Design a binder for this molecule. Structure first.
Ligand SMILES: Nc1ncnc2c1ncn2[C@@H]1O[C@H](COP(=O)(O)OP(=O)(O)OP(=O)(O)O)[C@@H](O)[C@H]1O
Ligand SMILES: Nc1ncnc2c1ncn2[C@@H]1O[C@H](COP(=O)(O)OP(=O)(O)OP(=O)(O)O)[C@@H](O)[C@H]1O
Ligand SMILES: Nc1ncnc2c1ncn2[C@@H]1O[C@H](COP(=O)(O)OP(=O)(O)OP(=O)(O)O)[C@@H](O)[C@H]1O
Ligand SMILES: Nc1ncnc2c1ncn2[C@@H]1O[C@H](COP(=O)(O)OP(=O)(O)OP(=O)(O)O)[C@@H](O)[C@H]1O
Ligand SMILES: Nc1ncnc2c1ncn2[C@@H]1O[C@H](COP(=O)(O)OP(=O)(O)OP(=O)(O)O)[C@@H](O)[C@H]1O
Ligand SMILES: Nc1ncnc2c1ncn2[C@@H]1O[C@H](COP(=O)(O)OP(=O)(O)OP(=O)(O)O)[C@@H](O)[C@H]1O
Ligand SMILES: [Mg+2]
Ligand SMILES: [Mg+2]
Ligand SMILES: [Mg+2]
Ligand SMILES: [Mg+2]
Ligand SMILES: [Mg+2]
Ligand SMILES: [Mg+2]
Lengths: 299, 302, 294, 301, 297, 296
């Protein structure tokens, strides 16, 4: 193990295992090894994510495609048992320009999708002790198999699954080989699926990119997609009907990512409520206007 | 006395795999093992654990027949070949090629249909942080493969295990790979042990390890007829349209598609064609409509 | 790990005690070993001599930075009415060198009231395998533990370089880990990562999106040069009639804040050499400034 | 605890000891330590080897040089006792490209040469327990001295004797230092010679390379050498009297190692006889004589 | 192991056993059996009811239906030979959960004669004394026919056999394996074990413990039941006290952790009354707030 | 054990126990119990008051009202069964703080019989002797009913159990777990332990230590209080001496660091008086002596 020895890590693992058993009572009889228990600290429950698929704007076709091709085949195998071709992908890639909502879809998958979610970082695998990283990867796949509808999420997967080179470190090379062997090898994986989000799809190795067959292009939002982005972002605000012209705001945000639109919303909200902020600091928020956004917009 | 592989579930897996091996070959009941060989026993792959036969791999029929006549028959039927010393099975086999073209499929078919005892070894079973334990693990792997006399030591992604040795290589990894070369082809040669590897990067393998893999199978990208064969195999046990489905057009337009790409395309086509049935069943919780060429070519890029 | 050194352990204990004195609620907080090593990089108050009143020219940028960064972060009760009023996840200071970005970070460290972590590439890279990623993860977990926290990366162009094949494996996986913790599945608390850079094109786009609030600390305007000269020449004897700051500001064309500092230092030093000579054996005037001007 | 705790290990050690005493009756009076008993499992007898010096083709000058400079100075010291310089080397390095015949020569030294053979491996040397590896190395040298004409063969010796650095393990550092001391130190090994085989000679430490002073370069075969290797491999195999032309195959196999030629011969015999095995498998008469085309169809030409 | 206090304890336990079961009277005991008699646990020495263990009701029911009733009432199960009592029982799990509570309730409410043996009574410095002690333990257990031999933290006694073990430890383990299941099999004797490290137990020793109970960490409803049991005969506020909130917010808590939390909460709630009593009505009824001060949410 | 000096010490401790608690008379102790009796410490041997621990006043009060009063005054806490004393107490934190100081103050004036055991007493070479020693330790602690068994540096004794541990250490730990919380539970016996490495302690052993006190490094106010306590019964200047400056510049210091600083400052301030005495009063302490050694 050599990572779940600390008392805080053991407490985290017990919390996550208790949550998993509460969600799936059949997991009570499932026993884990020390390395699998080390992986348990990477289990991410729907309670940790405060983000629903409803908070995703401009990706409704992508969400429906993701559902009907990924979520339901993984989560409803009885429905899809008419043909053996109706299966969940062995991997899923969410690739696109930065700020368009790949990790948003990952958070919604952690929350809304029934699948147990393991979000694994490189730091939780790379161990300086010899041969520990490969055992950690093997136990991650073993634990994902034991929690049978599991999703292994690797954020920024381009670095994890980088094109193998002769200059790669030995432990990294054995890590990548072990991941390729367990991901698709002699021994099949039962309803275990790997999800990756990345900005550079070309940095991913060809043999790793092959193991991510279902790829979702979370591209820069269109005009309508920006309209839905703004509608989702300015939820739970004033949004006066006469003072606000959302369509003009959406068309003025040419080449704007979702994170940039969040920044624009935050700036406009801070500027519009600044008088109320000063009054509250000394001791209502004015309706949001197109003037505030247009002042913050370049146009 | 290895410090790893002594877990209770690991011991249960070793007992189960040994039971399966003894049931397959009753002569192995008298065979005794050391503890390190018992930890190697967890990597034994028994034919019931594999769902893939040689009939499930399409477009590699010349390769499959060549693999049979040059690898499987000289190893599994030595009495037929016991007339010339040059008719012996190769000491190693390399299935190399672009990703997704069917190397693990051939490994699965070798584990199932060949009848050789199969050890699929991963590096996490070999690397041990304790000093001189990886070498003992490798020695036990070769000793166990010699005890189960017709054996295949399969190492998937063997280009990482048998990578080009260098001065920057780790000490334990260097002695591990040197021990692997010594046991693979050295003094006291193995009886009927064959080491099969699968790589995407053949040029990453060391020259000495490569020499020890004299039989090389290039599982290259499929051609038009080969892609038709893969599409026909993948679309078996599935309702297909009559006088409307054009598999030849799909195979022709899938230029550069590996077998995994065709598998994903077939999966997506089945998901698209059955979507109305999926909705109807979800409402409950006709049948799947026959797959047309328009269904395949909708998402197929030309 | 750097926590083996006796001096490093003493520094970590001193920084932890300063943090606990600042925030008494941190007494019950336990830290990992890697977070303890990150504790050596923490810049508590009463170490920085730079105040927000010590920066001239960029006072509108100071007020904008306050109202958009410090108050949203340090006063969540005022901004808690709406979920769009939270502090930015990242803040960028970019422009030409010598314009006061480092003082802006220093005044933020002294005056904002949030715990300040100043990290560097040299203090983040480790010799062993996987220790850099664990160190980055501990940095983010520590910044979450000290709930109002500002992580500073001076010369953030090098730390957040655009990813390419020429980058080392350790650096690439470090940057990916930084991305994952900065904006990933697990939302951070009131953690803000701030960097000062000279080149804005060297920053990765996926790291630029993580710095939504960008402040252009550019070359000063003429009124800004006047404010800079007034701040720099404070508590200094100046002539009531001979000294005139207007033409000093007007003649300084294409001069940054560091260049204005250099001009002020030379003008003060040529006059103070006479005082040193008198000691061995006069207010500052404009003519000394104009002599060095070209 | 000590290594080799298996009952099969005890059976192997006792069998090898009985073989050694049968070969040389003088060894019966020699008592062994526990670690020397564990080293006894690495004893290689000529009955375990089926490769003689006649099975190695294209290396006749190297084989004769190896004999007259290594085997005869060691196995027949009476002849060489006239001069103190006429002595066996402290070590022998068989280095070269992979597949060229170094392990063939080691097998032939184990079989034909009368020296007791210790084919040691790193799995029988390295031990996790403290100080056991050094005692194993010491007892290896003690046993080699007891079985007085002895060859300690370490295959892939570039990993055992790799260039020492500050990054090596403490156990390996003391292991290498103990091997260095016993190999060439104060106390003199009588007729113990350490033969090594490697592909990377440059990976060996200079202080260990100087302990392997008789170096044999088993290089890639020439056309004459390839002809001899093919003639050796194709012996006791039916070949065509007229259509078969070995010289053309030898000329066309440029850069082919001995292993490459062995694989070529194996696949040529498989494809040439393929009608015979098909009939036999149908049943379950005569193998067709091998022709030039059988090697040509498997060659690049 | 002979001393005046120990001899008095042995005599007291023997009269307790004789008064409990008249058949056990007029039975000759060896000196080593007499020494083993000091480890006999009687029902009055245990203050734990089966009702004092909450959150394990399926485990209590399974224990009664598979362990206690087959051992205690063979007459009901006499029709089929397959309904016999287990040779051994293992109560394994993480520390904190009620393995010792289960063992205490077995010592009090199963009705079997109980031998709670410890390593001090078994291990003996002199030659061959420990094996004779184990032999006498099994002989005494056979003499009191419905006997339970409870070895708490049984992973230390039944640890995996190795060469590094002492000669006397290996002989002890082999003697225990021989008497546990060998020739001349025992009567209604069951060796109940409790441990945290099940993997440390030897394979043959685990084989001799067929019926294994996993007393895992409590779930939310099990925590609610444990908190309800621990707060029995304790005044609780009618409206302020919310036990479900405390059960849901004590994630990862074992039963011992809940006991300590309840003790600390009671102390904090009754601090004012305790100070008033020390310097001179009743303890203040416990609220949710008292537990949430100590809670880390 | 089984020595003339050892038996004399055991007899002396037994007379001290019977003198303090008259009900302990006519109580028979086994040979191993008599051996454990040499580890009994008494208020005479400990010359440290709870008032001699500065800065830890909230910890002192918490320790009192949650440990000492529930253990030594059971009549007050009688009505509610949940008001019992903890089965164990752990004092953990960085070295230098008052963990042993707290243990000494508990040994003096908590009123409990104290067994300050060390690993030389418990661990024995002979077979089964250490388990019998632990059993007799618990039997003696139960006999002296309000007892406290203090094990300084308890991380080593209660370390995480492993199969690579010696069989006697594993058996010793299992016996300690069984007697600490098992069948036939102890009376008013509490196991207090001090450590710097709480993470080294086993999960079952840490479970058996429910009450845990973090004696962390002193703050500025705590440093002032510790300096005031350490500089008691010594002469300090009325005008030159200011404790707040020294407490401010002693950043990151523990109590031990302050004790050594105070000792160095006292030596340097009394150096000339000591030289005069060696040739043949104490100069009042000023801030110059403390800030001279201080590196700020
Ligand atoms: N489809 C969307 N719906 C709603 N908000 C969105 C959407 N896309 C982006 N955003 C906003 O922009 C932010 C982008 O964060 P996120 O982590 O999802 O980006 P990303 O696409 O994964 O980028 P990167 O991989 O570079 O981190 C979100 O937190 C949200 O505030
Ligand atoms: N010739 C084929 N016939 C049928 N299916 C195939 C064929 N080739 C590949 N596939 C499909 O591709 C999937 C992946 O297994 P495959 O054997 O292709 O991996 P691989 O070729 O070893 O590539 P990698 O080295 O990247 O693992 C299989 O599930 C299989 O369904
Ligand atoms: N507004 C200002 N008021 C006073 N001095 C200033 C101001 N701006 C810059 N300076 C001077 O510029 C010098 C250069 O440091 P400064 O903080 O400006 O660097 P910077 O803008 O962060 O540049 P870089 O990225 O090259 O480090 C300072 O030492 C300071 O004297
Ligand atoms: N000179 C030769 N004559 C006949 N056969 C040869 C010759 N060299 C090699 N071979 C064939 O190649 C096979 C392997 O050769 P060998 O094991 O000696 O390789 P090597 O030179 O030791 O390389 P490595 O050090 O990588 O093992 C032998 O079984 C033999 O049949
Ligand atoms: N299921 C439960 N119901 C009620 N109280 C419990 C339960 N489990 C534990 N407790 C409380 O916790 C205390 C300790 O529990 P117990 O003695 O069963 O643990 P243990 O099995 O000895 O731990 P270990 O596994 O470390 O030996 C008991 O005094 C009891 O009050
Ligand atoms: N709170 C305090 N008030 C006064 N003096 C103190 C205090 N804490 C420590 N000291 C000084 O430290 C000395 C004892 O230190 P102590 O042994 O308690 O440290 P510790 O934390 O127990 O060390 P360790 O954990 O390494 O055993 C005493 O002589 C005392 O002068
Ligand atoms: Mg992202
Ligand atoms: Mg594959
Ligand atoms: Mg700067
Ligand atoms: Mg060789
Ligand atoms: Mg217990
Ligand atoms: Mg102490």
């Amino acid at each position: 193990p050599l990572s779940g020895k600390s008392r805080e890590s053991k407490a985290k693992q017990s919390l996550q295992w208790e949550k998993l058993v509460k969600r799936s009572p059949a997991l009570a009889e499932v026993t884990l090894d020390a390395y699998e228990r080390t992986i348990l600290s990477s289990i991410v429950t729907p309670d940790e994510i405060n983000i629903t698929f409803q908070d995703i704007g401009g990706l409704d076709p992508l969400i429906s495609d993701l559902h009907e091709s990924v979520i339901y085949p993984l989560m409803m195998p009885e429905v899809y048992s008419n043909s053996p071709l109706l299966q969940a992908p062995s991997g899923v890639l969410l690739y696109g320009p930065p700020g368009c909502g790949k990790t948003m879809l990952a958070k919604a998958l952690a929350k809304e999708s029934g699948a147990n979610f393991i979000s694994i970082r490189m730091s939780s695998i790379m161990d300086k002790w010899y041969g520990e990283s490969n055992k950690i990867v093997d136990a991650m796949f073993s634990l994902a198999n034991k929690l049978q509808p599991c999703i292994i999420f690797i954020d920024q997967i381009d670095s994890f699954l980088r094109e193998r080179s002769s200059t790669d470190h030995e432990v990294t090379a054995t890590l990548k080989a072990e991941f390729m062997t367990l991901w698709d090898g002699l021994l099949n994986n039962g309803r275990v699926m790997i999800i990756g989000a990345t900005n550079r799809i070309n940095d991913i190795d060809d043999a790793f990119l092959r193991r991510l067959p279902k790829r979702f292009l979370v591209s820069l939002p269109g005009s309508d997609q920006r309209y839905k982005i703004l509608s989702v972002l300015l939820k739970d605000t004033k949004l006066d009907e006469d003072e606000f012209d959302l369509q003009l705001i959406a068309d003025n945000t040419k080449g704007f990512s979702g994170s940039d639109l969040k920044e624009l919303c935050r700036e406009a909200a801070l500027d519009a409520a600044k008088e109320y902020i000063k009054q509250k600091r000394q001791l209502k928020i004015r309706p949001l206007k197109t003037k505030d956004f247009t002042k913050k917009l370049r146009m």
